[PDB]
Coordinates of C-alpha atoms and ligand atoms in Angstrom, one line a residue:
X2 CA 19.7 0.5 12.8
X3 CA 16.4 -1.1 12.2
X4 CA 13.4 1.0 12.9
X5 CA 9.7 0.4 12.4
X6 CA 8.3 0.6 8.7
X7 CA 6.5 4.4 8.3
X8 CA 3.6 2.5 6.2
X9 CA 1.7 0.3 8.6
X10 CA -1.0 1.9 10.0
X11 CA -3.2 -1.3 11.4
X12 CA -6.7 -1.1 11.4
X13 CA -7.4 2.3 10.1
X14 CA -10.5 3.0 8.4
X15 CA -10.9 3.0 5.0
X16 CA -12.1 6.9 4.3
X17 CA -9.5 7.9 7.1
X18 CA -6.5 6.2 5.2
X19 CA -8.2 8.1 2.3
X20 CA -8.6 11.3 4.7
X21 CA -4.3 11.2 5.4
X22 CA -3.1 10.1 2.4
X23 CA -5.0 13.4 0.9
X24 CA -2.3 15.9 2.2
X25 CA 0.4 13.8 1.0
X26 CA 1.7 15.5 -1.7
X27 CA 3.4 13.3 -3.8
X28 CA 1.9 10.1 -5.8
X29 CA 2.7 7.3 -4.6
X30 CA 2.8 7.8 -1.0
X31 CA 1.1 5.0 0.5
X32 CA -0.2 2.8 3.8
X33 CA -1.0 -0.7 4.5
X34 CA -4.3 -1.1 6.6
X35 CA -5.9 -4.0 8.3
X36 CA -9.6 -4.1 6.0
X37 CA -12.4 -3.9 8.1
X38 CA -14.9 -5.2 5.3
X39 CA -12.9 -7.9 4.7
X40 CA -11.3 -9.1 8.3
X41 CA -8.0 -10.9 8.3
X42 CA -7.3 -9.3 5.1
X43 CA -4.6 -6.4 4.4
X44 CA -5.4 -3.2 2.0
X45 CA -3.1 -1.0 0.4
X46 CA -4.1 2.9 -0.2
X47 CA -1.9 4.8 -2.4
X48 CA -2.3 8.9 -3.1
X49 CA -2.9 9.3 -7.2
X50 CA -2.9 13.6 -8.1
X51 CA -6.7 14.2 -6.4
X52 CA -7.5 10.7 -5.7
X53 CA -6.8 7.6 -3.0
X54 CA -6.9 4.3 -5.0
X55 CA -7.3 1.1 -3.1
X56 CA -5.9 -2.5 -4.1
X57 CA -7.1 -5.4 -2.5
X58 CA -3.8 -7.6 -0.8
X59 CA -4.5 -10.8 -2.5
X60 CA -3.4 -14.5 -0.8
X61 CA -2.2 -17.8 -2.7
X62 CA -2.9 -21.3 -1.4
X63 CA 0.2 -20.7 0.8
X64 CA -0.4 -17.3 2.0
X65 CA 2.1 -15.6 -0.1
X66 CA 0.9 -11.7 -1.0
X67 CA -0.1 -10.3 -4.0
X68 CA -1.6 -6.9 -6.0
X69 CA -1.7 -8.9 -9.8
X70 CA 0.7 -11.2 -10.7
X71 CA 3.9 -11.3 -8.9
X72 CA 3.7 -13.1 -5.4
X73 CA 5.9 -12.6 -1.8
X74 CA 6.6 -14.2 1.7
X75 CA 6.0 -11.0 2.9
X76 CA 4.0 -7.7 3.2
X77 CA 7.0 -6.1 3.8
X78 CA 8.4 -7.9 0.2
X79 CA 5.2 -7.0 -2.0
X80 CA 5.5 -3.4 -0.6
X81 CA 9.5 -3.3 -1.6
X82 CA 8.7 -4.9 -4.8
X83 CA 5.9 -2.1 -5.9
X84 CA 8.7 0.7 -4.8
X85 CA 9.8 0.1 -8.8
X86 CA 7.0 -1.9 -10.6
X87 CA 4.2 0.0 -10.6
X88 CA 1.1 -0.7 -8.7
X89 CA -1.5 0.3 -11.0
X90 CA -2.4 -1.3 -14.5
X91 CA -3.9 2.4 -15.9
X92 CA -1.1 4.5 -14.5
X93 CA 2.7 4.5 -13.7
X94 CA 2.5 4.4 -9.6
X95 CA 5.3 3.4 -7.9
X96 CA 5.2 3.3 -3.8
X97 CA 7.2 6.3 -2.0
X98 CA 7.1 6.3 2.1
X99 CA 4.5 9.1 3.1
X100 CA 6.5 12.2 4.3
X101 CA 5.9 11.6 8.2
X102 CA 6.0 13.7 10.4
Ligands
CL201 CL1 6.3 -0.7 -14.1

């Protein structure tokens, strides 16, 4: 019964991804947003304790996705992927849905 994925959120701005993903309560919960600095380009914001970190969606040659290392045909992949490899070098973060309303 496929239904649309609770993390896209399109071209949200920067601070107000950081603004929502403030009242999540639990680390990890997370959005992918269309970057308005960087046009064409996806961002990923992910709620750490009192903070929103930001990671950059990175593109091979073939427009396969990325965070660091490990690469995907997909958004929807990369996202699955960093549900149980963390996606932070300096902490144990592993991407939960937000709790939607
Ligand atoms: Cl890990």
């Amino acid at each position: 019964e496929m239904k649309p994925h609770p993390w896209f959120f399109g071209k949200i701005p920067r601070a107000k991804a950081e603004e929502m993903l403030s009242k999540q309560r639990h680390d990890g919960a997370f959005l992918i947003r269309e970057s308005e600095s960087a046009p064409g380009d996806f961002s990923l914001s992910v709620k750490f304790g009192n903070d929103v970190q930001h990671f950059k969606v990175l593109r091979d040659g073939a427009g396969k996705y990325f965070l660091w290392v490990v690469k995907f045909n997909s958004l929807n992949e990369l996202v699955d992927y960093h549900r149980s490899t963390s996606v932070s070098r300096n902490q144990q973060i592993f991407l939960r849905d937000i709790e939607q309303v």
